[PDB]
């Protein structure tokens, strides 16, 4: 009798394949045929933030577009003023193998974690003037790969245990678990509503999650290797994944199909990070060949290069207001580009 | 306000100068083969932080990259090992480590443990590795087997090095192990420098 469910699966899969082939009228390359080309982009390094001792795994801006937090596996969480290149804070982390770090939309807290399977929440604006540890979210069984604040009290996190978790910070409680991936979740990305979020894993697929119902709503496949980076498009109706197969791919949420692929024969390295511009027509991808390529996310033509790092570009970040781009790297520097 | 900013910056920069002088006086090791257990030891007033990454789920190809700039990876193996072929698993792992883009300059300290358990076993190795019958040493039985495994690892190792990294195999006493890691890290640093000056 076990064949009944195999037949249900076989049938359902066929229906989904057919309903995804039928709603494919044209290719983005086509309706995108008569638009202008970006015009080759030439950004210059405007700032070099120095002070980190070892490779910079992560960074995140903060909703003022001036301050930024960076995480270095020397064991430091450095909060920099970007306008004056001044260090506002330097937090010694309890564990040095940090892989992610987040800046709260309110400015009061930062978060970081890594191979310790904990998300530490540090307070920035206290009565005794010195930043202290405020909370420690425990429960994951694999390294923290990404964390993001929903607000002062809630935080989402992705782990190398194939699971995402939504926490309440006051009670230090894992209020929701998100399961379904079969490989390490390497990146998460909140939608501008903070009601959904996509995650990308080492099973070569991305999943969309409702934050309140705790249910996977869509799965996306089409890469050939691990998805290392994922970034929501400015409007939330699509997202972009970057992979070890040396490609980026743009997926749509209302079509459930891969819309676009960004790749060149010259490029045979992996994509480490991605991020959109403020309008979303430029796609910035950091690579393992020490460079950052700027893709025309609508024409899929490589629009430019940022080539000022001596080691692996590890983290991208665009300001909330779109003024500057931040690149961290394994050369232990941050570069601010315009 | 900019005056206060410069004040805080100068204070932080003093602190960071101290931190920088502490960070280079310590050497980081990766032990291989809750999320991460740290160990700290001191030999001859040189400080070492070893890191055991037990606490992950057996798929290493992403978090291994965290250790691209350690002084060494200490790779422990059991020459002794419904019986799987575990020595071949260790060889395949060593080979994927040796040839990874981000660990190519990392010297590996190979520890071959349970040698006495092996010697107990060898009086079931010719089935796997059928070349063991023609192997010649460069209780002879135990020594031949042990050095055969060592030479398997060294054959993987001496193929794609290019001089940038080496293997330092030993047969394994926390005392002598600590001393051996000390000496091998000294040799790794010396070789990196001697290769910088085109002497090696």
């Amino acid at each position, epitope marked *: 009798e076990l064949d009944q469910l195999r037949q249900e699966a076989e049938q359902l899969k066929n229906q989904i394949r057919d309903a995804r082939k039928a709603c494919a009228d044209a290719t983005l390359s086509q309706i995108t045929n008569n638009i202008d080309p970006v015009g080759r982009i030439q950004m210059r390094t405007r700032r070099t933030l120095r002070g980190h001792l070892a490779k910079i795994y992560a960074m995140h801006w903060g909703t003022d577009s001036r301050l930024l937090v960076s995480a270095s596996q020397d064991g430091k969480l450095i909060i920099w003023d970007s306008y004056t290149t001044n260090k506002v804070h330097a937090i010694p982390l309890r564990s040095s193998w940090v892989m992610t770090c987040a800046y709260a939309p309110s400015g009061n807290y930062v978060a970081c974690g890594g191979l310790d399977n904990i998300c530490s929440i540090y307070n920035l604006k206290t009565r005794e003037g010195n930043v202290r540890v405020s909370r420690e979210l425990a429960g994951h069984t694999g390294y923290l790969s990404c964390c993001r604040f929903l607000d002062d009290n809630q935080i989402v996190t992705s782990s190398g245990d194939t699971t995402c978790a939504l926490w309440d910070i006051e009670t230090g409680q894992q209020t929701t678990t998100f399961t379904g991936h079969t490989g390490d979740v390497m990146s998460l990305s909140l939608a501008p509503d903070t009601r959904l979020f996509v995650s990308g894993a080492c099973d*070569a697929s991305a999943k969309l999650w409702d934050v309140r119902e705790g249910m996977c709503r869509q799965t996306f496949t089409g890469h050939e290797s691990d998805i290392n980076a994922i970034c929501f498009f400015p409007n939330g109706n699509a997202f972009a994944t970057g992979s070890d197969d040396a490609t980026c791919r743009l997926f749509d949420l209302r079509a459930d199909q891969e819309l676009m692929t960004y790749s060149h024969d010259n490029i045979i390295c992996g994509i480490t990070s991605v991020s959109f511009s403020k309008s979303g027509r430029l796609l910035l991808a950091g690579y393992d060949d020490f460079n950052c390529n700027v893709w025309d996310a609508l024409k899929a033509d490589r629009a430019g290069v940022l080539a000022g790092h001596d080691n692996r570009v590890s983290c991208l970040g665009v300001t909330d207001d779109g003024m500057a781009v931040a690149t961290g790297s394994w050369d232990s520097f941050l570069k601010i580009w315009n | 306000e900019e005056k206060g900013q410069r004040e805080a910056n100068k204070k932080i920069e003093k602190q960071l100068q101290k931190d920088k002088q502490v960070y280079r006086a310590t050497h980081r090791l990766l032990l291989l083969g809750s999320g991460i257990f740290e160990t700290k030891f001191q030999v001859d007033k040189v400080n070492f932080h070893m890191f055991d990454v037990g606490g992950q789920r057996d798929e290493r190809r992403k978090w291994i990259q965290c250790f691209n700039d350690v002084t060494a990876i200490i790779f422990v193996v059991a020459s002794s090992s419904n019986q799987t072929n575990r020595l071949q698993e260790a060889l395949n792992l060593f080979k994927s480590i040796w040839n990874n883009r981000w660990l190519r300059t990392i010297s590996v300290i190979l520890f071959l443990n349970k040698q006495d358990l092996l010697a107990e076993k060898v009086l079931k190795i010719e089935d796997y590795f059928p070349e063991f019958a023609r192997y010649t040493t460069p209780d002879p039985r135990v020594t031949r087997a042990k050095y055969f495994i060592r030479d398997e690892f060294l054959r993987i190792s001496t193929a794609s090095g290019d001089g940038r990294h080496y293997c330092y195999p030993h047969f394994t006493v926390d005392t002598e192990n600590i001393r051996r890691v000390f000496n091998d890290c000294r040799d790794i640093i010396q070789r990196m420098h001697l290769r910088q000056y085109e002497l090696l």
Partner: nanobody
Amino acid sequence: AAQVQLQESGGGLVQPGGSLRLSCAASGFTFSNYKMNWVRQAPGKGLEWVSDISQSGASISYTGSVKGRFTISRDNAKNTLYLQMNSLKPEDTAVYYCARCPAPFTRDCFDVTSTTYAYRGQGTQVTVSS
């Protein structure tokens, strides 16, 4: 959309000493940029790496127990992987998966025996007995 599929076939019963040819069809990736593996799992055992072949088809590696007996081959034209098995022994009875290496253009192959690896196939059965 597309997906990474590795479909084994050609497995069945066979007498001790017989011969079979396992055929793994591949889809979802450029078959040539990747190194390929044969892994197996017997009753009550972990996963075992059996054989590997490289992007071109020249570099070849075997586990010791199937050397002289098994022959891995690749066909980039027809995207196929083959394992020829002759002089079979009963201790080969098992499920046989064709695995891929995670990343293309690489010489290292991490995590092909992990019990959860994503780029493996569902396997084919081989039963050597009376």
